[PDB]
């Protein structure tokens, strides 16, 4: 296992996310966790990389402590991680082919000639090898996601932390980033987490669902396991229905005194 | 981590091909292009992005001398990455 | 009325002590670093290119137009006791002790200050200040300390090409339009042969008055809301919090300096 | 550490130096004083320096 | 090169033309038209509190920080000169003819003028313009033509807050420490002050100093792409254009009604 | 288009089609229209609107305090069918 968020707890000034959760993840392995709109799918990732310190709990990465290491330290951990981003998480200041060698120019020290070889090669794992002397704001919507993801392999990372991915979008390139991770999992050998909410497409690939209720953990099966699951709300985020655990309609707020007077 | 020793027509890789030894094997490759017909390595541990664009440069400069070059030997962790980022067969003969 | 009026009141009063406490932690973490003399050799020029190259359409053909209005006004008031000695003498003494500055200020904080806090601003909406946080590079020395260092030498670069487009602008009405061409005009202009008052005090205030106004435009557009309305919103209170900068301590300025 | 006792503390040290150097830079105006009538004194102002020589 | 030449200067020409034709037929359609009295009246006093309301704390705030500077540099050139009497004919007269419709006017671009070309713009890219084209309902004059109004008799009321309150800031600096009088400050300013001189003639400048600022807030956010870098873009635009229409009209405005 | 209501036999009978657009001469008459009507028959309508479904809530309520009921016959497809879509409760005239 790379990470065990054993009794993690993050809590805002306002409104709670999460009070006594788990998470589970091994190696080598696609582990989707699912959720409704609404609660913080985006801020879980957070924890992980170190951005944010939660009030109680731990992340114990394949031991060693996430949030105790903010003097010199955490910069060590962050470069095999590689963050991916809903939207363009590139700059714009730049052509596209500058942004995948971005961590190319600080961090690994690499001639001019041999540069131009490792990053033109990395661009073909996502078809976007003609597409490098192109402006980023000229891109599409699934289009400018995939340059990202040669930018996420261009450190040779153990822990793919895919932020809201395919949401949005067209079918064609919906079906093309659901390719891309299962090339980069049995031909490289990482770890991808998943966080999006698109269920009839990211259970074919992922190997560990965990879905999210009344801000808790109330599924921790597999992805052949999960449909037969007998609860109420772990069937809610299914196949579309209306009514269940949650209601779609608002309650009982004296309909009868302000529809006549 | 990264060594090598130099056999008549023959180049063997002992060690890692990471993205930080390679300093002393990219300044030191134009005397000894010339001596290879056939390559065999055997102790390697990993091949990531970083070291398989320094085996792709020595199939280039071998050619223009007249002669061809072989791969024997090859893992298949080096094989592996080549049909993912879609490779073709000039620049690394496989078998 | 002593419990409920004081309610909302707290509300109001801790969170300005934390609206300074992430403004002066933001600037204090990015000069005490490492000292890096050749990384950001190409990164200080492409932001002297944005806030100082892009702000010359506004200040240079609108500073003729200030010192144009300092002759012509500058001139019936004084029909009676000097009109056309004294013509060159409130254009070169106003425009270097509290025009250069400050009118400049509110120039430069419209162009190179209010574009300074939609371009960090957009940054946080799209995630790409999040993005460079996740590798091992600093985000607070990328997109923070070429930046504040492009307008803390930009602003008295900008005010010497105000002043002289402010003198000049104010010879097109004094060697034309009824005028004499250096006999009278010229040789009452250089009176302040010190090199304390008007050479000093113009440069000693426009320093001051460009780190005031870089800090608020690189404060507003790290600290906002990431949406499409949290960034119109700071780009508004920027120039509101740099008018009053520029002008509350125009008077403060001037009281030890000037008396 | 934390996100919400550390930055009420720099908050704090701000505040007091742009106010401590705004009260040290406005000295723009055992005091033994004197007492002497005049009988014409003009149009004298207040706070005008005295002077011998 | 010479043929290839034109090639980038002569199709600015045509976007230029373009331009400044479509803000003419966007405010000829928003006043020319139904005379909607009864239901533009609730819609013009929703659109004077951000626009006169919430603006006026900037104004106040600098009225008083605009006469403690100038009246306190006015009283070091008047020295050795026996005509302190005369400080009404600086602080109140540079205030009226020079200063008020100019200064006032660069601080309602800033506050009033910016947050009108956001507010345009975000409900752009939220398509609720487009969505009163649905409602048989003419989008032109009823999110435009309440907003025109209210900035045109906004900054004429706001002229007069600056200079009044900036007449009494010169007197808070005047009767501070100097030891003049009441009587004098007061008897040189009733002097060449009379109907269609200088407060009547004051009046005519802000008035064009008000239709030339909200025209160009109004266009701008009308004429905006519909994304994060649209509005933000669009934002800054009228910054920079009303602080050359405003100085630009001084040299205009300048030579007919001397004073 | 048209408003022909009539009350002899104690019974309102409307006529032509209930919109949001003609509603004026049976709003403002509507006090000193029912006192003792204990049933409502409509035959000559075609289609009834969300604002001509809110004149004949507000009936109801004006016969309520009166001490009797009323009840209503003749309904056509288009009233029950609207008006299980916004989903009266069992505190105004039913179904029945």
């Not at chain 1, 999210?212 to 992805?223: Q, R």
């Not at chain 3, 254009?91 to 120039?107: D, F, T, Y």
Request: hydrophobic share 50%; aromatic share 8%; proline share 4%.
């Amino acid at each position: 296992n790379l990470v065990d968020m054993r009794d993690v707890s993050f809590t805002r000034g306002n409104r709670c996310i999460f009070d006594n959760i788990s998470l589970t993840v091994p190696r080598g392995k696609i582990t989707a966790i699912m959720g409704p709109s609404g609660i913080g799918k985006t801020t879980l990732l957070r924890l992980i990389g170190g951005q944010i310190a939660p009030d109680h709990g731990e992340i114990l990465f394949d031991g060693e402590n996430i949030p105790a290491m903010s003097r010199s330290r955490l910069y060590t951990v962050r470069k095999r991680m590689s963050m991916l981003f809903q939207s363009g998480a590139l700059f714009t200041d730049m052509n596209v082919f500058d942004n995948v060698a971005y961590p190319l120019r600080e961090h690994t020290q690499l001639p001019a000639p041999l540069l131009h070889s490792t990053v033109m090669m990395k661009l073909e794992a996502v078809g976007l090898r003609g597409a490098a002397k192109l402006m980023p704001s000229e891109l599409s919507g699934g289009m400018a996601r995939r340059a990202a993801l040669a930018r996420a392999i261009a450190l040779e990372p153990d822990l793919i932390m895919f932020d809201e991915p395919f949401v949005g979008q067209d079918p064609i390139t919906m079906g093309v980033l659901v390719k891309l991770i299962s090339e980069l999992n049995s031909a490289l050998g990482v770890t991808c987490v998943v966080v999006s909410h698109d269920v009839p497409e990211v259970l074919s690939i992922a190997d560990h669902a965990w879905i999210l209720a009344d801000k808790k953990i109330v599924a921790h099966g597999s992805a052949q396991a999960l449909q037969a699951n007998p609860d109420p709300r772990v069937r809610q985020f299914l196949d579309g229905i209306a009514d269940g655990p949650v209601p779609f309609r608002y309650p009982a707020g004296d309909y009868h005194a302000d529809l006549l007077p | 981590s990264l060594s090598w020793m130099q056999t008549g027509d023959t180049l063997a890789l002992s060690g890692e091909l990471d993205q930080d030894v390679l300093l002393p094997l990219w300044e030191m490759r134009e005397e000894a292009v010339k001596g290879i017909t056939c390559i065999d390595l055997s102790r390697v541990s990993r091949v990531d992005t970083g070291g398989l664009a320094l085996l792709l440069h020595l199939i280039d400069l071998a050619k223009k001398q007249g002669n061809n070059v072989t791969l024997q030997g090859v893992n298949d962790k080096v094989y592996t990455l080549a049909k993912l980022y879609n490779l073709p067969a000039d620049v690394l003969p496989r078998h | 009325m002593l419990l409920n009026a004081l309610a909302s009141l707290g509300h109001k009063g801790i969170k300005t002590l934390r609206t300074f406490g992430r403004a002066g932690l933001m600037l204090f973490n990015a000069l005490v670093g490492k000292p890096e003399f050749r990384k950001h050799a190409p990164l200080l020029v492409r932001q002297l290119y944005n806030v100082g190259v892009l702000s010359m359409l506004i200040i240079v053909v609108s500073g003729v137009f200030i010192g144009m209005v300092l002759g012509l006004q500058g001139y019936l008031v004084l029909t009676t006791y000097s009109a056309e000695t004294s013509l060159g003498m409130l254009v070169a003494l106003s425009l270097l002790r509290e025009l250069g500055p400050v009118v400049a200020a509110l120039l430069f904080a419209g162009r190179a200050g209010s574009a300074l806090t939609a371009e960090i601003g957009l940054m946080r909406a799209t995630e790409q200040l999040s993005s460079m946080e996740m590798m091992a590079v600093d985000p607070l020395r990328r997109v923070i300390s070429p930046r504040f260092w492009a307008g803390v030498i930009s602003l008295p670069l900008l005010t010497v090409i105000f002043v002289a487009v402010g003198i000049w602008g104010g010879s097109l009405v004094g060697v034309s339009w009824k005028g004499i061409d250096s006999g009278f005009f010229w040789s009452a202009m250089q009176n302040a042969v010190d090199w304390r008052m008007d050479l000093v005090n113009c440069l000693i205030k426009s320093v001051v008055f460009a780190i005031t106004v870089t800090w608020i435009s690189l404060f507003n557009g790290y600290d906002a809301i990431p949406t499409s309305a949290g960034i119109s919103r700071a780009t508004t209170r920027t120039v509101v919090h740099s008018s009053l900068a520029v002008l509350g301590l125009d008077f403060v300025l001037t009281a030890l300096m000037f008396g | 550490m934390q996100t919400k006792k550390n930055e009420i503390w720099v908050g704090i040290f701000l505040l007091a130096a742009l106010l401590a150097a705004l009260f040290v830079c406005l000295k723009a105006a055992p005091t033994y004083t004197l007492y002497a009538t005049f009988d014409n004194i003009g149009g004298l102002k207040a706070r005008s320096p005295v002077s011998i020589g």
